[PDB]
Amino acid sequence: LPPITPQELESMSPQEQRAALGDRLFLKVYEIAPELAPKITGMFLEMKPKEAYELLNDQKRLEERVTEALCVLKAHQTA
Amino acid sequence: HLPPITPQELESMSPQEQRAALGDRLFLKVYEIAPELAPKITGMFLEMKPKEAYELLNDQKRLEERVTEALCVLKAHQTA
């Protein structure tokens, strides 16, 4: 999917923002954690739209948020 | 442990005074959760808005959640 412009993000409803950001976040997370990509994307969609949008423009920040999300899920695993 | 900060004191303190007051009380609570990394975790909390750091002193569950989140941010910053 082509990137969302900053002008489109401010023009979308919260429902439209979630669908547009969620589809692009899922594809990028799928390249890092394919099995937990739907679960991690749902965690990302709880952030503010501006915060989730920065993940689509900074690869290094997206990797750290995925690593952070995996660590939080691992922390709750009473292994 | 220090006595809790009242909401009226927080609004009357300067930004530097808020850091000292919140930082001392946040450190004592985080120390009971992560004693070794408590100073670094407290510094991460002091970058939040004063109202948000104050809620961590009044909500135990959210405090534990933010510490776990802060610990996971530190793990993500590993060079190796």
Numbering used by the authors:
A (entry chain B): 482 to 560
B (entry chain A): 481 to 560
Q: What do the study authors state?
A:
NMR and X-ray crystallography reveal that Leishmania has a unique type of N-terminally-extended cap-binding protein (eIF4E4) that binds via a PAM2 motif to PABP1. Exceptionally, therefore, by binding tightly to two protein ligands and to the mRNA 5′ cap4 structure, the trypanosomatid N-terminally extended form of eIF4E acts as the core molecular scaffold for the mRNA-cap-binding complex. Finally, the eIF4E4 N-terminal extension is an intrinsically disordered region that transitions to a partly folded form upon binding to PABP1, whereby this interaction is not modulated by poly(A) binding to PABP1.
Obtaining these structures enabled us to locate the binding motif for eIF4E4 in relation to the three-dimensional structure of Leishmania PABP1. Consistent with the structures of other analogous complexes, binding is associated with relatively minor changes in the conformation of the PABP1 fragment; the side chains of only Lys 520 and Glu 527 are affected. Our results suggest that the changes in the roles of the respective translation factors in Leishmania have created a biomolecular chain that functions without poly(A)-mediated modulation of protein-protein interactions. This outcome is consistent with the observation that the PABP1 PABC domain forms a stable fold in solution that is only minimally altered by binding of the eIF4E4 peptide.
